[PDB]
Amino acid sequence: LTSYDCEVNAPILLQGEELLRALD
Amino acid sequence: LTSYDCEVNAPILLQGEELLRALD
Amino acid sequence: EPREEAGALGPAWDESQLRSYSFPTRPIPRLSQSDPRAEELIENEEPVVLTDTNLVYPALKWDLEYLQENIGNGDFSVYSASTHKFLYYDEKKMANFQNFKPRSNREEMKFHEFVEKLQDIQQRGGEERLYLQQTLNDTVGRKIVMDFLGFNWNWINKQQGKRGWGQLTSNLLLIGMEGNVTPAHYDEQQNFFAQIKGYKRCILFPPDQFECLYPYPVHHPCDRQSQVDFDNPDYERFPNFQNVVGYETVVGPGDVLYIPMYWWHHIESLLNGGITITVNFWYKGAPTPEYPLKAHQKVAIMRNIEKMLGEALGNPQEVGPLLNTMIKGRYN
Amino acid sequence: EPREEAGALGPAWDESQLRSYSFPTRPIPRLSQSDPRAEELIENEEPVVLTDTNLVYPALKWDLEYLQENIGNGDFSVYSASTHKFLYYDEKKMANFQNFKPRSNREEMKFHEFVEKLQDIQQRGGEERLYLQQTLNDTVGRKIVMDFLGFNWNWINKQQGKRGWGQLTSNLLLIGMEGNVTPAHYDEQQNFFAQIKGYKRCILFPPDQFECLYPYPVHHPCDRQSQVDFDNPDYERFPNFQNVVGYETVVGPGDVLYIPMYWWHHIESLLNGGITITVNFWYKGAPTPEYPLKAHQKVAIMRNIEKMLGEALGNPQEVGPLLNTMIKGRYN
Numbered sequence A, B: 001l002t003s004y005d006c007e008v009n010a011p012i013l014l015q016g017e018e019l020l021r022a023l024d
Numbered sequence C, D: 001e002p003r004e005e006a007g008a009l010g011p012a013w014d015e016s017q018l019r020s021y022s023f024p025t026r027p028i029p030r031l032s033q034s035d036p037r038a039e040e041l042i043e044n045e046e047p048v049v050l051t052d053t054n055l056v057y058p059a060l061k062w063d064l065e066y067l068q069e070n071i072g073n074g075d076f077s078v079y080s081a082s083t084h085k086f087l088y089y090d091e092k093k094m095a096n097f098q099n100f101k102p103r104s105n106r107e108e109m110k111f112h113e114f115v116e117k118l119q120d121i122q123q124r125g126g127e128e129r130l131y132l133q134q135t136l137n138d139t140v141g142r143k144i145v146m147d148f149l150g151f152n153w154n155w156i157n158k159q160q161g162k163r164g165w166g167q168l169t170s171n172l173l174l175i176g177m178e179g180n181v182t183p184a185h186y187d188e189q190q191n192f193f194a195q196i197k198g199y200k201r202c203i204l205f206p207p208d209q210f211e212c213l214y215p216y217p218v219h220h221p222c223d224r225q226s227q228v229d230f231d232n233p234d235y236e237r238f239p240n241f242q243n244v245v246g247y248e249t250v251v252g253p254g255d256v257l258y259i260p261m262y263w264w265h266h267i268e269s270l271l272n273g274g275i276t277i278t279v280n281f282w283y284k285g286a287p288t289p290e291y292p293l294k295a296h297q298k299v300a301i302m303r304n305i306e307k308m309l310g311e312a313l314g315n316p317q318e319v320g321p322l323l324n325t326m327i328k329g330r331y332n
Ligand SMILES: O=C(O)CNC(=O)C(=O)O
Pocket: B009, C174, C181, C182, C187, C191, C193, C259, C265, C267, C268, C278, C280
């Protein structure tokens, strides 16, 4: 009940952690 | 969420179905 | 209109024996058990008075003398009150509501002690009121066992089977003084309510009248009971009680009232009608399997939200403030 | 008091560039990354402006010309508005609220098209406003890739590790016109907010100010955003907005603002300050494991109740009436 999602003001092409690793 | 309990105006010695069968 | 007792024994009761309330009602149908309409009502979870089930035929001879002589030496829960209202409360929930002060007290006694108490009040013209409410169990004596076995199990077992109900959990024996009232509440089990001695006026309200009846918070001892004082309704706190509409009937010896699960009910022993005796049959409801949702399903949902919040917050008194915080300026 | 730019270049900004609002605020601390107090604040999920992380040092040279030349031919989401307020909305939830009419529209375009649009507005003295908001992905060109790799991953990876956070989900590139406002809302991820060009005033409110900020219903497109119009607060609908107290700061090139998960934030590009550029770093929060419960935990609970009710009722618009039915005359 205390659990939470990860929604932000942007929709859910690599990005974040995936972008970084692919690049490195 | 639609599930329900069986609380009534009485607390929760055999009784009900158990009383009946023991007797019969 | 009050029925006429067979043999020209006159009206079983009259209007002056009914308490006066602020809302209108319509009659619950009184039907024969063989009438298809009765089956339709039960199937649809709607109340009906059945006049000829012979459900507790053998108990029709019961009275205080016969019961004292035959019901054993087991303990009976007897409530004592200074008011006609016997508001039910759950003792296990009292710790969480230290400020709740019950108007009635439970005392455990032997049947003959209950009977003696009733006698002392009568003789001393006392205003005290008693209401015995005790589940039938193995301590009852031989004759009561014989009587109980003579109940119409054939008929009620078919009902249980036909409706997909769960098990019989208990049979509550209720013995009340004239004028006693069990204030409006709903129970979470199916109920065949079998009248044995005297007359009780039963006022029922469908589950969709939840908004008009204002049950206590789930964690309060009076969970499932209405907060409205039917004798002095506070319309400022409970404005929709002005919209309540009941279904009513008066049951007498031999009658069985089906009180469907989640249906609100207010029960009163007729003024000046002497003691009343009733035995109920409580069955767990069928299993929770489609839209649109039924009223009683929404009630189950609300109860569940209250229950989960109490557990998650770790203090049931925090439930209200969180709910308020959720709705103000957002959903209200 | 506005800071002085190195080299006697005068005040970075002045009071007249800030919009005027109805509530008081206190400053967010500005500290060095090496200052133990900064670590304490982040550990405790409290905001802090870090002045020397060099988090996006290589991006400090970014401007429209350099980005147009190097950021690739991928699509960029650009919002267009007739007002300074760019209220965020979730397009997937629009079907369930047919009457919601967004004040801004999203258009997908190439970077050079965004730049051209900005130019046309300037020249034609238009009142139109644009706000590019686009997650950084694989279509960016070589130089941007080089810049991105030059971010201070060493420092931010340690932060991620130290706080038990989950993965970096994305980096949002925000390019706004002077005067643009992102209205108050909270995000469910941890955020290091790295300012690159221009100045943005950030007003934050702790999660325990939920009662003062009145977020939309969870199923509404503006879920997580405040319903209060900061420019014309309706105290009749939102009386506790009269009790709101913010934490504020103005960030400029090189500054990093930690916006802790669940903290409300209102962000505005200074009036007459030219375009602004920011890159955020969004990380999923740590795992849900003790009483008393934190404010943000109660917020999570409320969101969950809303979510479950919407699913159980089968229509999110039924959520409000059920909640109201639950509390009136019972918990309010
Ligand atoms: O008969 C009474 O006074 C009370 N009975 C019930 O509420 C019941 O049987 O469910």
